[PDB]
Amino acid sequence: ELVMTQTPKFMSTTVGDRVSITCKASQNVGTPVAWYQQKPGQSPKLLIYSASNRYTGVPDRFTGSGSGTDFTLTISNMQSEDLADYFCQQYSSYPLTFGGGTKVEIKRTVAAPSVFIFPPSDEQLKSGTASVVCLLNNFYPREAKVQWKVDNALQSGNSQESVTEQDSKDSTYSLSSTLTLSKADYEKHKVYACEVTHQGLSSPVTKSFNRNE
């Protein structure tokens, strides 16, 4: 099938530093190789074709190299605008093949999250359930621990988390922790707290509220 093996799968790099992505062809392909860039939510963009031909509009920051079965994409100067995924392709023989891709992220200094808590809305409660949302805004690195506490009881198995892709303007991440409880359980309890432990915090900060009203 003329498999294109791409490596590494993941790479993290500081703005100002360089990055190299490589694709090994199972067979000889010659020069018909290309590369694409894809950020979250958008479609792939043509970056390079002919192994080293740089599509119009694409900065010299990107450079394609190699020939035969060894090809490489290089970002001579990693910048905020390069935060995305990268795919290599081969079009010397049918069927056309793609590389496994590379999630290219940015490495930066540690940053502590700003924490907010959101009590369920009056509207939702009459539906028969409650949602309690805790938010960890703009922090780094991705790794984070969030625990819930109601009337001081450490909840478990009743919360789900979601994490944003790395932000281009900040190079930071964000996270939301949603606690789901019944209108019942929720009206018989009062103190809802969100505890956040993270590298940028000298000790875990906690956000909470009372079931006011």
Next chain:
Amino acid sequence: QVQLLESGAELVKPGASVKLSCKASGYTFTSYWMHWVKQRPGRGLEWIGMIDPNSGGTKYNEKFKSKATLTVDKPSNTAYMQLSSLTSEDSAVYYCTRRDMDYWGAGTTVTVSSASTKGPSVFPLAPSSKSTSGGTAALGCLVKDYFPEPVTVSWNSGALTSGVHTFPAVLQSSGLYSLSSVVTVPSSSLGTQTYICNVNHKPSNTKVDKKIVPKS
């Protein structure tokens, strides 16, 4: 300006088929080969095969020869990809791309399931509820219990883009999706500025607008 328009997300029942469309504008249609690519989460990209919008000639990726069927229609410059006997394996985001792949469609998310469609319920995430902190305030909308993906969110009809965070959706245990979209703004804008999240779920033809006022 080349633009490849692809149909809205599709929810398809197992064993049925679906016909995805890709209408070309901004260039001579019968002038370029059109491809189709399949993309699954944390998965590589896959070329399905291409078709000649002029000759009718078609070539396929040997692995998709049995499930995919490519065609076109000059009168409408629209290309079509039909998939048959769909299974959860065909669930993915499909794209159509020009011959050299310098132009891509936005993509059509296809989900294969026996579960029925369901529009999202949208709840407000009250600004600095009661206790108004200092500097900047956060607020948003909880969009939950909808099926299948995707769902689009915008603030004040696209007028607000600064400080907006729309979290990736997570499948709840109920088999229903859920997510929150938040935005951070100056606490002095509250009350005076009206924040409205516009949620869309094309699969259920659902369109919601929700005002977010400072918790009371």
